[PDB]
Every structure is written in structure tokens, then in C-alpha cells.
Design a protein around this nucleic acid. Structure first.
Ligand SMILES: [Mg+2]
Ligand SMILES: [Mg+2]
Ligand SMILES: [Mg+2]
Ligand SMILES: [Mg+2]
Ligand SMILES: [Mg+2]
Ligand SMILES: [Mg+2]
Ligand SMILES: [Mg+2]
Ligand SMILES: [Mg+2]
Ligand SMILES: [Mg+2]
Ligand SMILES: [Mg+2]
Length: 1105
RNA sequence: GGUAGGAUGGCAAGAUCCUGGUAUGCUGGGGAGCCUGAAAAGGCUACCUAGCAAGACCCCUUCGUGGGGUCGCAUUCUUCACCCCCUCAGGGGGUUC
DNA sequence: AGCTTGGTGTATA
DNA sequence: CCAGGATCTTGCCATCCTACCTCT
DNA sequence: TATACACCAAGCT
């Protein structure tokens, strides 16, 4: 039943939102707002305290499971080896707590003459070592571990610290020796530092390394006289570790050849391609204009750059010595950002990094690889590229030379450049061949080699294809639902408009400062890269650069604790921790002393420093604040000042708060990816154009069409001075999308110019033909938006999570309690009974014909009957037997021999009883644990209606009135509520207001509310749908900054959020005209009952069929 | 020309996962020291050991309430229903008020 | 006596 | 916390291609 | 361009 019309799609992506608009147009004027909805999503986020997505939490849990599985297999293999050697592994019980440690100590100290005792001690020591083997680089092998210095420098520092601390020198001073000695000498000592939430000093400060444990194993072997084959087998069994792997399907594809993976940066084809392309983009000044390099010129430059052992040829060197130009500046189009004193000409041209590193490794390891050195000298570039590609792809989860195994291991240990380039190896070789044989650049080489035209673009993903990024996937799912529904309603759009998260309206001072910052970062990164490569670190990561920078900035001292640190034992602390959403920006990164980081844990810094006697908050603040800016460092002067301020602000925080920095990076990815998929849709559906505009253009357009969100949605002012932003009303996303449907490139030019002139500061109206035509076309848009807002047509909707997947229970296992049969049983004790059969039989004792337990938690339900017996289906419990109880009177399930609290509620089942004119309502709050122990997490189960047994936590902790009404036959399930369901109270609004809710509804008469949770058995948590919690939170922040700049309405909003309406269920569902609104993708409520969730009124909803 | 978009390379700042590890933590089983107690058993500080979503599927086998292998918290309208796409009944997608 | 509000634990680095 | 692999974004520089707009 | 919920306790009419 599609009714075709000319309409435009507007897409405004966001981190936790997306505004979508279908706006029908006659000629170029907006005619009708067909749909306007702000969809509020979670951005993929689970466990809202941290910003960690559900995907990230699933990956972390899966990898913990994989770690534990591999550990079980590895310890089983070690157990088989120990049985082969006749060495007794450490028993699970009835041994001394220091048996393994004293075994390690004695085997390191003295030869054990008794052979049976010696083998028992060896088995104890080796099994315990494999349980506690310390850390090594996962990419390194057993030979690499054996080649590491033994023991590590960290253990030598630890050992001299312990020798000074305890005034004794154990010889040779192994980890097992020191731990056994300290557990005997200072009983109750902790070995490794833990979270400090009483508090004594630990034995060790830094992370244990596998070369320390290996050195202890060698010491034990030398003292006990063990054979070398036995020691080798024990080393390979103890220190066995799975190689990290890269799944090939997560590698991107070549756009010019989609059957081929993208090539690595190590590839010789890429090195030559990069050199040739960079040379082909160079230009020579020829008569107030530029010409490309001649064939001999580019051949000379390319051979000079390819035949380089070291990066020593600058662009000035290429201009002066290779091209023999009269002037340094005669070479134009140098691919560098220029600076003072010809910085761009002093930068280095590209070279062959793989060939240079392989030549250095051949020259440095001549004795190790004579066969490979001769093979590399003999063989040409194609076979060199084949072997280099094999070494680059060795890390992929899915060598053409009969080489010795030691040589093969050595050249598998060589670090080549990492990272994927845009094109495959085949494409790079073909483009390089065309570029060198002809005199052409990459574009003409692409046209020649692949037969593409000047209009060619790389292939785009389709709408149904996810990216794997959770924010982007949320935005994409909502957009594709909206577009499918809108195409069925009105046909394909004439044009699609996407807002990109880009902006360039900055002052000249800001652009100059950013350029200076880029220059300083590049110079210091190059210096630090050179130093780290001189320290045997081929490719420093950004974390490596930050680590070296902070080690130089604080002169190798723990930032918090002041203790001396090295590269090996230091840690990079998130000052705001990861479980608080803390970013990896370097103002959140502190270099720490290992123990110092672990003792901080996940607590905020000022609270931890107040509790701890290791650090002082003021000492850390003065240490950060006395940093003196040297002229030649990574930061500029203003960047250094901002960095110190940000670090001090992160150190000063006392309560667990989220990260203050909002990253726009997910929003930009969502905009770009959704644009690409909308382009694919438009190619499949004949859409005229997918246009893109920046968000500053959208803001400017709203400014010059007199589109004020507060006037549009009748919002009282919240600030004393100025006007509040659009962030107060969530409908602004949809309004942005509507405004985006009006934009043209010329008027975007005009509005961007107006924005740049205004930000470099009344005011003056823009003047341009595009601007005048756009004002004439969009004169009525304000009236359309006022009428649409007056009809309550701009929906704010949250998508529902109906799948019963996620955390089945809370992660903390808890000890069970006990209670004797013959004692007196209160209501809470009967409600906490673990076993369903014992709970059901006690239920039948308290109420014989009953199927539910209706107890008040404080009433004394059963007296102390000394002769009470329960006859189970398989046993009889007398009065002396203990009944296992859950530790607390809250919903809990039995998991793995312990008790776990239920997780958050998946849904609530709405039950209604009483008369039709005054019905009573209650919620059966249902969690994932309820469906798990009910057997409802299986195929073919409607989880919202499938019957739950009475011993589930849902029915145990349902309200007493609900339990009585369900057993009396009066209460029936008439619907269900999930978090994110919309409660629309109608035009009559909320009438049961009492207290602060009345004061809130005085200024904000909100009729649309979002179910956020079910905090107890009688209550539902409702926040207003249209009002944003972030506006009220930044109000609460800014209230402590300026005197009384908030309006009374803004203050009442600030006190209302974030707890909002903690509402009684019987007061909410007793509203006549209240409806539970389940919207379609277009924001329209679903009232027809099909196979999707539909709207329903709790007053007159039918009992469930 | 200017703006905008897209390519490739470089640089800078970040985001998102993925693989492999470490150390704690929790619970069960222990116990080295100390303390409270003992004709009257538990705590505290550590350390050892097992497990760390409930569970699902496949094979044992020198026949068992276990041994082994691969997995299980993402893809937000579960399940059902209809339609679509890619893979042989698996996965993904849409369903207009 | 029953709804109004305030504090707090939750696996982590 | 650690190493390190993959995907992507924003900003700047160089080159190539596209569409679009506005003053001589 | 974003950032809790479920449990436990007080608490003035
Ligand atoms: Mg926007
Ligand atoms: Mg392991
Ligand atoms: Mg270990
Ligand atoms: Mg320890
Ligand atoms: Mg930390
Ligand atoms: Mg928006
Ligand atoms: Mg432990
Ligand atoms: Mg231990
Ligand atoms: Mg398991
Ligand atoms: Mg579905």
C-alpha cells in the first residue's frame, strides 16, 4: 500500500541517539513532516558505570574462559609429565600452606639426598611454579624466554630491596626462596600488592616475570643435578603459551580486488609503492607553475630512495643533490606540513623500511643466519617479497625455503613494520609496475591497471552489513528500520542528507596553536622513536611513546609513590580508571610503580591517597605542578599548561564519576558508515543524491530559520543569563534531521562562512543567492515544526531489548547461610530457602493448599517446633538437620556451589485484579536468573508469558498483595514492561503528583515517561522521555560555579534528575488514559496486534491468551 | 577559483574490538602463624588448591553421575507469524497505525 | 502505615 | 595491568577524481 | 555528541 511522494531523509547520528526525519517536499519547499523521531539508544553500552559495551564485556568474559580452558589443559599436560618423571604434584588439600614455597626454597638451597623426598619436593615446586609462572611477552617463544636475562632487572631490584629491608642475603635469592623465608619469618605477609579498599607492607612490588621463574627453575635444576632433557621438557611444559593470532576475516579487503586481503606495511611491494607514489606526486617549479618530474628525474629520485640503508635523504637533499635543482624551494608539492626555517624541506623522504631492517638484522646476526644472508643476497625482489609476506603474515590464524630451524626461529623473531595498507600485494605490485613503466601517478595507474574510469569509487557496504562497532551498529539498525518503514509508506526518498561529525570553524590562533602542537608532537615522537629503536624496540606503540615521555618527564620515578622505576616494571595507570570510562588520552595516563598502581586499583585517586599511607595527594599535585616547561618537548607551552591542569583535575577527584571527556569518534564513524550504506541503498533504489553537511551548518541553519528548541517545545528557561542549548529537549535530534533535509551545498557554504565570522568575533543576516533561495523555500518550516510539536508528533522513542541474553546473575559468589528445621522460621528465612523442594515443602507447611509463599519478612511464621519433620521426595529432614539458605533476603540463585544475586530485571509482568472501575495492579519483576532457573532460556519460549515456578526469585520477592491475588484467582497478567518502554499519560498528564514531582510538573508537564527500572516490588522508575539527564547534570555541575545563575525551574530540574520519578506502581497504572506506547520505526505507535510489540492500555488490556 | 565529498601516501590525536597472558578478587575444599578459646571450635592475617556465568553440543568405554574436545553474556521488536538476503537447516535483515 | 527520600554495593587492574 | 594484531574516525600536508556555487 | 539500578534503611506527617 505504498503511496509515492517526493520526500527527503534526514539523518543526525549520535553517541546515544539518532534523529531521523522523512520530510515531504513540493519543488524545494518543505510540505509535510511525514515522520520525525529521536531514537535514544545505548550505544551498545552494558554496565553503565563503565563505558564498556556489551560486545566488549562478552569478549572479555570469553577470553577469560579461553584463558582458564588453556590453563586447565596446560596444567593437565604438566601433571602427565610429572607422573612420567615420578614427581608428586602438590595436593589439593591436607598440606601446609607453605609446603610449595619451602619446597622451592629447599631445592634452590640444598641438594636433597633422599630420592623420594627430592622427587616429591620437585613435583610440588614445579606444579606450583606452573600455577604461578609470572608474565612474559605472549608473542615471544620459549627460546626467546631462555634468551632473556635471568633473573630480570625487576627481580634484581626487588631482591636488593628485600635484602635492605630484612637485612639478610638469601643465595641465589630466588622468588620461591624469598617467599618461603618471608612467610616463615613474617607470618601473614602478602606477597603481591592488592586493592586497598588491615593494611601491611607486601613482600614484592613489581610484576613477576617468567625469566625470574625460569631462573629459579635453572637454580633448582643445578642444585639437584637434573638432566638437561628433563629440565627442557619441564620448561616447555611449565611456560607453554598459545601464540596470539589475527583472524584473517577481521583483516580488511582490497577495494580494487575484494578477494585479496589488504597488504601489511612490511611488504616490499608497499615500500616500493609508497616511494614511487610519493615521487610521482612531487612537482618542479616551471614558470610560475608546477610540472611533474620527468621520467629520468623520477627514476633517479626513486632509485636514490629505494637504495637507502638509512633514512638520511631529506626533501632538501632530493631537491639539491638528486634532482640538482638550483634552489631548495624549486621542488614544490612536498608532502609535508611546512614550518619555520623550511621544516617541510628538512623532513625525510620515505625509504624501504623492511629492506633496511632486514639488512640491519643480517649484518647484526651474521653468525646466526649465513644461509638466509646468502639467500637474501642471491634472490630477486619477487621472491624477497614472497618471503617477506610470509614473515608478515606469520601472525595470521589462517616458508618456501628448506631452512635450518634455528635460522627460521631467528628470522621469525625479527620485527618488521606492522599495520595494513589500503591495497593488496598484487595491486601494489601492478600499480607500481604501471607507475614506473609509465610516467604516471596512482590515479592513472589505477585507471590503466584495473580499467577504471575517472568516476571510480571503492565498493561500499550494504545497509544490512554491520561494522562491528557497537555505536555505529546501533545507529545503523535504527536507520535501516526507519528507512524500510519509510520506503514502504512513501517510496524511496528523493534525496538523503547525513550530518557528518566534522568542523573547521576555528580562530586563527586556535589553528596556529594546533599546527604548533602537531609540529611539537611529530618532533618529539621522532626523537623518542629514535631513542627507543636504539634501545632495541623496533616499532613503538602510542603507549610506548607515552611511557617513554612520562619516564623522561618524571625522571623514572613513580608519579604517585615517588619510587624509582624502569621501562620494564612501570605501569601506565588510567588516573580515571577504565571501569569509570577513563580514556586513553595521555592526560589520563600516569606512569606508576606497579605496586603503586595495584594499590590504587579502581578507586578514585584522592580517595585512595587519603586512605593510603604510601602516597600523599598534595605531594602528587605539587609534583605535577612543579613541572617546568623546557622549550624542546612534546607539548607546546599552552598544551603543557592544559595537560598539567587536566592531570591535576583527574588526581583531585574523590567519588566514582564518569569520564569528563566525550569522544566524538563513534559519532564520526557512525555518520561516515551510515553515509556509505545510504549511498549503497540509493544506488539500489535510484535516489538522486546522498548529501552530507557538518553539524555547525545544522546549528547555523537552525539559528537563521528562527528554530529555537525552547520556543518550539514551550520550554521554560533554566538559566538566569542567556538561553539554554538544544540539549534540554531530546526532540532536538529529530528537529536537526528535519533542518538537514533543507540544506543545499551553496547555503551550507554561506552558513559556514557566517559561522566562521561569528566564531572569530549584531548579528548580520547572510547575503547569497543560495541563502536567499533557501530562506524563501524554508519560510514555512518554522510553522510546520510548531504544528508538528503541537500535535505531539515528534516522537522520542527507546528501542526495546526483548532478548533474554546477558548476565544471568551478579558475579560475586556468596556463602550460604544455614537454619535448623526445629527452630522458629520468620518470613525472610522461609523466603531465603535455597532448594526448590525444601522451599515448596516449607510453603506447604505454612499454607497447605497454597502454591505460593505469602509471608511478611518480619512475622514469626513457624514456631520452634522441636518435632518438625519434612519428608522430601528422596529423603527426610528431621529437626536437627540444617537447611541451606541464601545469605540475604533478596532475589538470589544457586551458582557453582555458592549464591549469586540476580542481575538487573529483564522485564516486569503486569498483573491486574479487582473491579473494572478501580483495578489493582502489581508487577512481577523477572530477571534473567528467573528464566534460567525456570528452564526458559531455550528454543520456542515466549519469556514474557511463560509460567515461572513459585520458587523463582520473581515469585519469592513479588509483593504480598500480588501473591494473594494470584492465588485467589483474581490477578491476571495483562501485559509486560521492559526497561525503555514508553508510558504516555495522555493530554490529562500526571495527576498523582506528591512532593517534588508536583514542583517538577509545574514547570515541566511531561506526559511521556520512560521505564528505567523496577527498584522494589511496589515501584517503577520513570524518567521523562523528552528531557535529557545530561542537561540537568551539567546544571548540577555549573551550580557550584556561579551564584544563582539557574532559574528556579532549572534548580527543580537539577534536583529531580537523575533519580527522577521513583513511582508507586499502583499510583501509575491507576491513571485512566495511561497507555504503554510501543512505537514503530517511524515513531508512530503500534496499535494493531500483529507479531511485533503493540501499544496497550493497562486499564482495559485483556488477560494474556 | 572557492566550498564540499571521495582516493592514495605521510604526520598528529583518539575511538572500537580481537588474540594471548599476568596478578588480585569471590566461593568451595584446606592450613602456616597468631588470637580468642579448650573437659566447650571458631575467628583474623596470609598462603595452597579447585572452580569462576546457569549451561549446550560431540566423542568416550581400559563403563561412568565421570574423562576429553568445541563452545556459551555481541548482532536491542524474545518466542511465534509473514516477507527478504547469504550460506546447508544455520546465520542475518525488515514488518508501515 | 505506607509512600518520600537518601545512601550504597556492584569483580578488577 | 602487559604485548600486539585488526577495523575505523578527526585534523593537517601532498596528489588525483567528482559536484556545486559565485564574481569577472 | 553520552554517561544506574536494585536493596536497605530512616523518615515526618
Ligand atoms: Mg548532530
Ligand atoms: Mg594460563
Ligand atoms: Mg601464572
Ligand atoms: Mg599476593
Ligand atoms: Mg590503574
Ligand atoms: Mg543529534
Ligand atoms: Mg587466588
Ligand atoms: Mg593464595
Ligand atoms: Mg565451566
Ligand atoms: Mg528479530
Amino acid at each position: 500500500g505504498t503511496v509515492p511522494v517526493t520526500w527527503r531523509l534526514g539523518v543526525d547520528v549520535g553517541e546515544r541517539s539518532i534523529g531521523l526525519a522523512a520530510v515531504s517536499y513540493e519543488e524545494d519547499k518543505p510540505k509535510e513532516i511525514l515522520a520525525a523521531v529521536s531514537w535514544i539508544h545505548d550505544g551498545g553500552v552494558g554496565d553503565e558505570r563503565s563505558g564498556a559495551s556489551r560486545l566488549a564485556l562478552r569478549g572479555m568474559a570469553r577470553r577469560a574462559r579461553r584463558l582458564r580452558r588453556f590453563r586447565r589443559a596446560r596444567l593437565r599436560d604438566l601433571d602427565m609429565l610429572l607422573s612420567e618423571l615420578g614427581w608428586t604434584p602438590l595436593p589439593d588439600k591436607n598440606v601446609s600452606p607453605v609446603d610449595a614455597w619451602l619446597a622451592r626454597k629447599r631445592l634452590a638451597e640444598e641438594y636433597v639426598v633422599d630420592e623420594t623426598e627430592r622427587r616429591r619436593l620437585l613435583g610440588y615446586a614445579v606444579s606450583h611454579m606452573a600455577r604461578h609462572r609470572g608474565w612474559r611477552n605472549p608473542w615471544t617463544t620459549i627460546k626467546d624466554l631462555k634468551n632473556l636475562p635471568q633473573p630480570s632487572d625487576s627481580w634484581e631490584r626487588t631482591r636488593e630491596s628485600l635484602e635492605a629491608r630484612y637485612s639478610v642475603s638469601l643465595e641465589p635469592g630466588t622468588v620461591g626462596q624469598w617467599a618461603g623465608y618471608l612467610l616463615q619469618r613474617a607470618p601473614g605477609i602478602r606477597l603481591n600488592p592488592t586493592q586497598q579498599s588491615l593494611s601491611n607492607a607486601t613482600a614484592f612490588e613489581t610484576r613477576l616475570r617468567q625469566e625470574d621463574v625460569l631462573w629459579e627453575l635453572r637454580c633448582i635444576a643445578d642444585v639437584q643435578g637434573l638432566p638437561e632433557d628433563v629440565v627442557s621438557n619441564v620448561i616447555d611444559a611449565v611456560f607453554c603459551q598459545k601464540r596470539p593470532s589475527v583472524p584473517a576475516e577481521r583483516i580488511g579487503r582490497d577495494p580494487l580486488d575484494p578477494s585479496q586481503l589488504r597488504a601489511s606495511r612490511a611488504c616490499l611491494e608497499f615500500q616500493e609503492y609508497r616511494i614511487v607514489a610519493a615521487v610521482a606526486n612531487l612537482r618542479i617549479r616551471d614558470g610560475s607553475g608546477s610540472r611533474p618530474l620527468s621520467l629520468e628525474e623520477r627514476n633517479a629520485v626513486i632509485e636514490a630512495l629505494l637504495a637507502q640503508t638509512e633514512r638520511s635523504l631529506t626533501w632538501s637533499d632530493i631537491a639539491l643533490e638528486i634532482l640538482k635543482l638550483p634552489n631548495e624551494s624549486d621542488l614544490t608539492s612536498v608532502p609535508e606540513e611546512d614550518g619555520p626555517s623550511s621544516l617541510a624541506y628538512s623532513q625525510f623522504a620515505p625509504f624501504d623500511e623492511t629492506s633496511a631492517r632486514i639488512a640491519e638484522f643480517i649484518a647484526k646476526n651474521r653468525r646466526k643466519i649465513p644461509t638466509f644472508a646468502q639467500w637474501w643476497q642471491e634472490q630477486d625482489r619477487t621472491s624477497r617479497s614472497d618471503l617477506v609476506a610470509a614473515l608478515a603474515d606469520n601472525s595470521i590464524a589462517g616458508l618456501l625455503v628448506h631452512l635450518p630451524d634455528a635460522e627460521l626461529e631467528a628470522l621469525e623473531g625479527l620485527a618488521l613494520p606492522s599495520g595494513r595498507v589500503a591495497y593488496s600485494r598484487l595491486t601494489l605490485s601492478g600499480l607500481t609496475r604501471v607507475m614506473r613503466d609509465d610516467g604516471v601517478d596512482v590515479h592513472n595507474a589505477r585507471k590503466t591497471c584495473f580499467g577504471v574510469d575517472d568516476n571510480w569509487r571503492p565498493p561500499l557496504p550494504a545497509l544490512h552489513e554491520a561494522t562491528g562497532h557497537p555505536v555505529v551498529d546501533r545507529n545503523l539498525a535504527i536507520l535501516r528500520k526507519f528507512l524500510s518503514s519509510a520506503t514502504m509508506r512513501w517510496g524511496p526518498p528523493q534525496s538523503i542528507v547525513v550530518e557528518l561529525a566534522r568542523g573547521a570553524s576555528e580562530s586563527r590562533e586556535r589553528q596556529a596553536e594546533e599546527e604548533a602542537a602537531r609540529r611539537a608532537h611529530r618532533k618529539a615522537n621522532d626523537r623518542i622513536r629514535a631513542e627507543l629503536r636504539a634501545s632495541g624496540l623496533s616499532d613503538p606503540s602510542p603507549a610506548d611513546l607515552v611511557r617513554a615521555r612520562l619516564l623522561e618527564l618524571y625522571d623514572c620515578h613513580c608519579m604517585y609513590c615517588g619510587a624509582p622505576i624502569s621501562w620494564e616494571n612501570s605501569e601506565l595507570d588510567h588516573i580515571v580508571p577504565r571501569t569509570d570510562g577513563g580514556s586513553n588520552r595521555h592526560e589520563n595516563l600516569a606512569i606508576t610503580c606497579g605496586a603503586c598502581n595495584k594499590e590504587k586499583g579502581r578507586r578514585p585517586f584522592a580517595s585512595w591517597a587519603e586512605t593510603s599511607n604510601r602516597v600523599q595527594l598534595r605531594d602528587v599535585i605539587d609534583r605535577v605542578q612543579k613541572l617546568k616547561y623546557s622549550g624542546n618537548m612534546y607539548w607546546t607551552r599552552d598544551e603543557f599548561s592544559r595537560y598539567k591542569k587536566s592531570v591535576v583535575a583527574r588526581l583531585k577527584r574523590r567519588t566514582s564519576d564518569p569520564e569528563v571527556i566525550q569522544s566524538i569518534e563513534s559519532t564520526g564513524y557512525a555518520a561516515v558508515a551510515l553515509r556509505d550504506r545510504l549511498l549503497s541503498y540509493g544506488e539500489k533504489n535510484g535516489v538522486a543524491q546522498v548529501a552530507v553537511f557538518r553539524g555547525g551548518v545544522t546549528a547555523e541553519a537552525r539559528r537563521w530559520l528562527d528554530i529555537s528548541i525552547e520556543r518550539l517545545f514551550s520550554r521554560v528557561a533554566i538559566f538566569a543569563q542567556s538561553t539554554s542549548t538544544k540539549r534540554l529537549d531530546r526532540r532536538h535530534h529529530a528537529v536537526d534531521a528535519v533542518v538537514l533535509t533543507t540544506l543545499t551545498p551553496g547555503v551550507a557554504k554561506t552558513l559556514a562562512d557566517a559561522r566562521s565570522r561569528r566564531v572569530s568575533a549584531s548579528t548580520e543576516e547572510p547575503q547569497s543567492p543560495a541563502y536567499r533561495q533557501w530562506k524563501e523555500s524554508c519560510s514555512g518550516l518554522g510553522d510546520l515544526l510548531i504544528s508538528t510539536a503541537a500535535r505531539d508528533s515528534i516522537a522520542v522513542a527507546a528501542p526495546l531489548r526483548l532478548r533474554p541474553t546477558g548476565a544471568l546473575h551478579e558475579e560475586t559468589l556468596r556463602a550460604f547461610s544455614e537454619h535448623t528445621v526445629g527452630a522458629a522460621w520468620k518470613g525472610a528465612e522461609l523466603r531465603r530457602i535455597v532448594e526448590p523442594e525444601v522451599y515448596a515443602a516449607f510453603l506447604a507447611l505454612t499454607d497447605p493448599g497454597g502454591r505460593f509463599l505469602k509471608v511478611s519478612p518480619s512475622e514469626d511464621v513457624l514456631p520452634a517446633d522441636e518435632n518438625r519433620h519434612i519428608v522430601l521426595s528422596d529423603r527426610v529432614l528431621g529437626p536437627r538437620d540444617r537447611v541451606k539458605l541464601f545469605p540475604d533476603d533478596r532475589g538470589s540463585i544457586r551458582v557453582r556451589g555458592g549464591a549469586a544475586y540476580i542481575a538487573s530485571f529483564h522485564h516486569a509482568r503486569v498483573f491486574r485484579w479487582g473491579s473494572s472501575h478501580s483495578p489493582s495492579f502489581a508487577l512481577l519483576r523477572v530477571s534473567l536468573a528467573d528464566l534460567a532457573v525456570a528452564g526458559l532460556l531455550r528454543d520456542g519460549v515466549d519469556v514474557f508469558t511463560a509460567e515461572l515456578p513459585p520458587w523463582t526469585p520473581a515469585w519469592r520477592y513479588a509483593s504480598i498483595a500480588l501473591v494473594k491475588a494470584v492465588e485467589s484467582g483474581d490477578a491476571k497478567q495483562v501485559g509486560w514492561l521492559v526497561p525503555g518502554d514508553e508510558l504516555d499519560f495522555g493530554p490529562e498528564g500526571v495527576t498523582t503528583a506528591a512532593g517534588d514531582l508536583s514542583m517538577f510538573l509545574k514547570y515541566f508537564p511531561e506526559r511521556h515517561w520512560v521505564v528505567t527500572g523496577f527498584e522494589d516490588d511496589k515501584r517503577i522508575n520513570l524518567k521523562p522521555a523528552f528531557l535529557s539527564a545530561e542537561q540537568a547534570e551539567v546544571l548540577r555541575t555549573e551550580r557550584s560555579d556561579r551564584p544563582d545563575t539557574l532559574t528556579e525551574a532549572g534548580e527543580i530540574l537539577a534536583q529531580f534528575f537523575p533519580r527522577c520519578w521513583r513511582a508507586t506502581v499502583a499510583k501509575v497504572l491507576c491513571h485512566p488514559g495511561l497507555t504503554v506506547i510501543r512505537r514503530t520505526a517511524l515513531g508512530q505507535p503500534r496499535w494493531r496486534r500483529g507479531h511485533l510489540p503493540y501499544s496497550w492500555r493497562p486499564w482495559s488490556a485483556d488477560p494474556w491468551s
